[PDB]
């Protein structure tokens, strides 16, 4: 009954291994409910779930889920049922689902939930019909039953961005909250009449004759300060 469009993979960091036994400093901190946390250390998991599935913004008083928080602390539901309550939360609909289309919302729910980037643009095409046929509640449980969710998160780990940085290096890739914001350039530009009409304030006035031209040694002073 209409299987998914057979897309193709690509080259990424999460589908190879690291050879990192005893990983040093850039570990992304496995908060889990098999380490048996105290009641002040359940609270450091619930903040990490809110920071992963929302951004750091929407951890407001109105966007908290105080009945879903209590059922985690009674060990009634798991972490996998707690992430599913956060995408089906009514703050996640009106802030992150009404302001972008179905092909950008798949880029949110694979970067935050699976912790990997999208493979190519056909995977956003291949996944966006699941939201329009059986709904968002039918979209999350077919995304939380994938083998990429179970083989490194399972039923007890709040997800994270897997292999963001290369171990000898210090730059790496971009964090996913700074990769895909709440809305993009294509939703912002079409609404410039009703919403998003701001016009911009004045910049600091730089005079025009102080700007560097080709063959000026002031275009290399940022190179010299990195020496």
């Amino acid at each position: 009954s209409i299987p998914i469009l057979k897309y193709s993979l690509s080259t990424q960091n999460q589908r190879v291994e690291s050879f990192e036994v005893n990983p040093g400093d850039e570990q992304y901190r496995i908060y889990s409910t098999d380490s048996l946390p105290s009641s002040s250390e359940v609270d450091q998991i619930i903040w990490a779930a809110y920071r992963q599935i929302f951004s750091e913004h929407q951890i407001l008083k109105s966007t908290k889920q105080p009945f879903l928080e209590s059922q985690l602390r009674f060990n009634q539901i798991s972490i996998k049922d707690f992430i599913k309550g956060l995408v089906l939360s009514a703050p996640f609909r009106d802030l992150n689902y009404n302001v972008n289309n179905n092909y950008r919302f798949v880029e949110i729910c694979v970067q935050r939930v699976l912790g990997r980037d999208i493979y190519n643009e056909r995977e956003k095409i291949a996944w966006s019909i699941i939201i329009a046929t059986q709904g968002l509640e039918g979209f999350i449980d077919t995304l939380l039953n994938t083998q990429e969710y179970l083989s490194n998160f399972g039923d007890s780990i709040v997800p994270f961005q897997r292999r963001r940085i290369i171990p000898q290096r210090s730059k790496g890739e971009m964090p996913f909250n700074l990769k895909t914001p709440r809305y993009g350039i294509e939703f912002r530009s079409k609404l410039a009449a009703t919403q998003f009409s701001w016009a911009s304030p004045i910049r600091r006035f730089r005079p025009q004759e102080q700007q560097p031209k080709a063959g000026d040694p002031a275009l290399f002073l940022n190179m010299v300060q990195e020496m």
Binding site: I2, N101, R122, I125, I129, A132, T133, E186, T194, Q195
Partner: protein, 172 residues
């Protein structure tokens, strides 16, 4: 998602004032046509699967190269996908007819839809005529007067027409 009432409010809060006095009278104009707004949608969802299969057969009375071997809508996965996309487009224009403006139509369905089909290889204008085979199967179905009494309601079916050709130019 905004209905017809929220589009007035979101333009006035961006400016920052309250609603005018003619300001609701035009919204109070909308609610005395409220039964006439609703029972149009009581036609177009209650005969909704008839509108799909009549238009999808009559598209290949016009362009039978889609069902040709090598064509786009040839195979049984792809014939099940062509009836899928015409069921979704008919679903969102029924949502806009109960709203009053097209804001749920071009935020869910039509936004970024041309660039899907060009990356898929689906012919762009050849699905737009499938939408126009559903409009005349529905705006003639809206003018039918089974069960309801008689009054002039040509203004509302122009908006029901007005969603089907707003959606038609967004896939070409």
């Amino acid at each position: 998602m905004l209905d017809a009432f929220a589009k007035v409010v979101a333009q006035a809060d961006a400016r920052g004032e309250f609603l005018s006095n003619t300001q609701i009278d035009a919204l109070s104009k909308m609610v005395k046509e409220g039964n006439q707004r609703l029972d149009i949608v009581n036609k177009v969802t209650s005969n909704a699967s008839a509108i799909v299969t009549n238009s999808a057969r009559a598209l290949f009375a016009e362009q039978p190269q889609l069902i040709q071997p090598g064509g786009n809508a040839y195979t049984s996965r792809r014939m099940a996908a062509c009836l899928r996309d015409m069921e979704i487009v008919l679903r969102y224009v029924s949502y806009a007819m109960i709203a009053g403006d097209s804001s749920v139509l071009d935020d869910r369905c039509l936004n970024g839809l041309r660039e899907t089909y060009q990356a898929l290889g689906t012919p762009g204008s050849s699905v737009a005529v499938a939408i126009q085979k559903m409009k005349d199967a529905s705006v003639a179905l809206a003018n039918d007067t089974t069960g309801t009494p008689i009054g002039d309601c040509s203004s509302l079916v122009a908006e029901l027409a007005g969603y089907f050709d707003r959606a038609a130019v967004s896939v070409v």
